[PDB]
Amino acid sequence: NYAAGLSPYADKGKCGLPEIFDPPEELERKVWELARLVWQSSSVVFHTGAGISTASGIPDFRGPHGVWTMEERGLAPKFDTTFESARPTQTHMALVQLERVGLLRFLVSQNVDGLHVRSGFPRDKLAELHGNMFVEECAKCKTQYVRDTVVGTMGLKATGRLCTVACRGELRDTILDWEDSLPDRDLALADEASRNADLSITLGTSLQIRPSGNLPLATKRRGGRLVIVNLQPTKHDRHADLRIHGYVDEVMTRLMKHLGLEIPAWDGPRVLERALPPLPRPPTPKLE
Numbered sequence: 001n002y003a004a005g006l007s008p009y010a011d012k013g014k015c016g017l018p019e020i021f022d023p024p025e026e027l028e029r030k031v032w033e034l035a036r037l038v039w040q041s042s043s044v045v046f047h048t049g050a051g052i053s054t055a056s057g058i059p060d061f062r063g064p065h066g067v068w069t070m071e072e073r074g075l076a077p078k079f080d081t082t083f084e085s086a087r088p089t090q091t092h093m094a095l096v097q098l099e100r101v102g103l104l105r106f107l108v109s110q111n112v113d114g115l116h117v118r119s120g121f122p123r124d125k126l127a128e129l130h131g132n133m134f135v136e137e138c139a140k141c142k143t144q145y146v147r148d149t150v151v152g153t154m155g156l157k158a159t160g161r162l163c164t165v166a167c168r169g170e171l172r173d174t175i176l177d178w179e180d181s182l183p184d185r186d187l188a189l190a191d192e193a194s195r196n197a198d199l200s201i202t203l204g205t206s207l208q209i210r211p212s213g214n215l216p217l218a219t220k221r222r223g224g225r226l227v228i229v230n231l232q233p234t235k236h237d238r239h240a241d242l243r244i245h246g247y248v249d250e251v252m253t254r255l256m257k258h259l260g261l262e263i264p265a266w267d268g269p270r271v272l273e274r275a276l277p278p279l280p281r282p283p284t285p286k287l288e
């Protein structure tokens with residue numbers, strides 16, 4: 001599917017760079033520093049890529065066993081789940097809670113795996129820049145349908161289903177192929193959120209794919225801070241105020257402990273169109 005569609009003519013970038021692990025004492029220092037930046041920031045934007053779904057059994061693109069890295073060896077990527085059977089990671093559910101308590105303003109994802117939506121993360125605070133395997137859109141009225149199963153096409157093709165709005169418009173997948181321009185609404189919202197942020201945090205993205213990978217720089221260009229959490233080096237390592245080399249679930253569970261926040265239970269696939277009113281959160285530490 002997705003891999004087969006983008007494999008011909010797309011630039012795959014740098015595959016299979018070595019992983020780096022901050023040793024324990026340095027990891028603990030950096031996650032405390034991340035908590036300080038979250039406490040001190042007014043507008044926090046998260047940027048997610050395929051590395052936040054590897055701990056749910058979905059391979060990334062450029063990691064040691066990524067789709068492209070394995071393709072170079074004539075090997076298929078390995079799934080430990082279907083898209084339908086995948087559960088949101090600790091990181092996915094941490095991001096849900098950060099939004100609920102008002103510590104996350106916006107979420108920009110390159111992931112098509114549908115897990116942010118299925119985690120119950122509100123769609124009005126999410127930009128899905130590369131599409132969502134579960135979402136089809138009416139070519140006529142632009143109404144979106146979030147399905148319980150993957151839409152079986154990619155490259156913005158007709159799925160064979162028709163719009164049911166009181167329309168009969170042709171439903172199409174939302175999965176960009178290499179030559180497709182990004183959805184204009186999602187990209188405009190993601191660009192605005194990134195420019196307005198005083199803190200951008202990237203999780204499990206190598207930031208190699210434009211323009212998605214450059215949005216966190218919009219935050220830096222306006223005087224905001226940039227944190228990169230990633231096992232591999234990334235394209236924009238030189239611009240980060242803070243670089244954390246560790247498993248994103250270990251980083252995010254330690255962060256949530258510092259913030260005094262619980263990672264909520266996942267009640268199975270659920271779609272939330274609009275953010276609910278913000279929940280209470282712990283009072284903030286005296287820093288210095």
Ligand SMILES: Nc1ncnc2c1ncn2[C@@H]1O[C@H](COP(=O)(O)OP(=O)(O)OC[C@H]2O[C@H](O)[C@H](O)[C@@H]2O)[C@@H](O)[C@H]1O
Pocket residue numbers: 006048049050051052054055060061062063066110111112130203204205206207208209229230231232233246247248249
């Ligand atoms: N558990 C983990 N913890 C931390 N980092 C991790 C983990 N697992 C993997 N990584 C890192 O996660 C990084 C993932 O980088 P890439 O594989 O490029 O995925 P993308 O989302 O940025 O790909 C962008 C687009 O490219 C495609 O064309 C599609 O359109 C994609 O949307 C690696 O550097 C791993 O080291």
Ligand SMILES: NC(=O)c1cccnc1
Pocket residue numbers: 002003049050053058059060061067110111112113114
């Ligand atoms: N996390 C993802 O969206 C994804 C999709 C297809 C292949 N690898 C990763």
Ligand SMILES: [Zn+2]
Pocket residue numbers: 138139140141142143163164165167168169
């Ligand atoms: Zn329609």
